[PDB]
Amino acid sequence: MIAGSMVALVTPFDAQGRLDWDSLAKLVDFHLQDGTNAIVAVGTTGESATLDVEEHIQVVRRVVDQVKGRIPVIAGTGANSTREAVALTEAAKSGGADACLLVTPYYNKPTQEGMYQHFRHIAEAVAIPQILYNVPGRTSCDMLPETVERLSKVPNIIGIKEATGDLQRAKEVIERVGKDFLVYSGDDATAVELMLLGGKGNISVTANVAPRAMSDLCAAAMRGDAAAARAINDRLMPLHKALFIESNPIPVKWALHEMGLIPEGIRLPLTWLSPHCHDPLRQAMRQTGVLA
Template sequence: MITGSMVALVTPMDAQGNIDWDSLTKLVDFHLQNGTHAIVAVGTTGESATLDVEEHIAVIKHVVKQVAGKIPVIAGTGANSTREAVHLTKNAKEAGADACLLVTPYYNKPTQEGLYQHFKHIAEAVDIPQILYNVPGRTACDMLAETVIRLSTVKNIIGIKEATGDLERAKQILDGVSKEFVVLSGDDPTAVELILMGGKGNISVTANVAPREMADLCEAALKGDAETARAINEKLMPLHKDLFVEANPIPVKWALYDMGLMQEGIRLPLTWLSAKYHETVRNALRASGIRKI
């Protein structure tokens, strides 16, 4: 089962916006060494919206090859075109990904029936475990609990990343799906509470800079050790909050650069973190114990 702390991995780039393969290798090693339970390659935090199809597939292949089966690799393969999502999902399977993460179609605003048919079609087209991904704040498309419950019985659809931060919504889903269906948080501040309610883990932005801490947090919550999990979460709360002072992944890429783990690179239309927020993010790293000075 896919469970625990799953990093929504950034895609490192150079100053011209080209993929920095050496830094990608360094980041994957960083997670393998620090207890991350799974890697999500080319999701929202990986700038999936601005990588072309060839780059998208190349990043998945690179991560799969380097991980070499040590932990699961989940490939982001969602798109607002069902045909494109099928194409990406097929290629992720061929690359050796363990599962795929499929965001709700953005911009074109499908109905709930359209969402059901979209995800059902992909699941029937590609025989690989698939995780739904609901993040209406980014997509302008909200997949309601009843649609998730309906999709939970479709072969190959094994779970959902529920990123609304709405614990009542998460409870609705948990109450309506089988115990085998994997409900994951996609919201770092509320992940502990979702796991304690019966969720199986968290797809995390914070884990990019605090992999060991997020792994410990998820392990404690999965064991039902609420006191330990909440204590870790409280310490990490400055990061949960301040890694979103500008649109993700702008702040987290700057934080990784500040930590010496990647170059100063991001792809338009996203821009490098505004100077006025540098100390805000650096102070969050300090307050969370990630940066010592």
């Protein structure tokens, strides 16, 4: 049952960088207890780039075991190599994950046709629901609406995460794919509209620090309650902007730490929120009420 507020869960590390299993458990209880509908473990925010193939599935395994069915658990499995996406995706299934989120290829700029037979292959090679992921801002390629529609017809491809933040884009994708095809938001700031457009959720970074609030806003958004959604949103907006004052998840982790939920750990090349951006974020957290 995959829709609503879906925290793009961070992967906590201790001061020396080793996975801190204690923080992960608490964070899972945290979202488990404050309304979160789903959890995306090992995604862009959970630092998928810098995890061992071994670390990858251990994080997917530990969350799945804790959640125990109460919520869906979506595993990040995209890769710029089809064979490597198969491996990760198969490793997520034989792990318990409820579904896989697969970003489009990143460095090597495939053709639209290539992205088609890329996801189509994985969807055929692994018997697990897969969710497309578009974010050209990171991966220097863009999966046009025509190609989304072709993939929507494929049997295991249940939905897509649209992160461009462009609302004419969601509109177009939504007006071409079935009622079965779930469109999710990957841009917190404009998620409310995507949902009012027919969107079925928001894979959020903001949910990491304001879980109860994000589920309320997705609820209202998907309920047709356009008044309430904005009301919350405009309250949360300053947090939406601050959390990206530096490439995500650098900021969201600083906050998580300032709340006392995770150690100060992050893997290279990533760095810790540089000095200059500390009060901008803290005021956003204080003004929004997630801190003190």
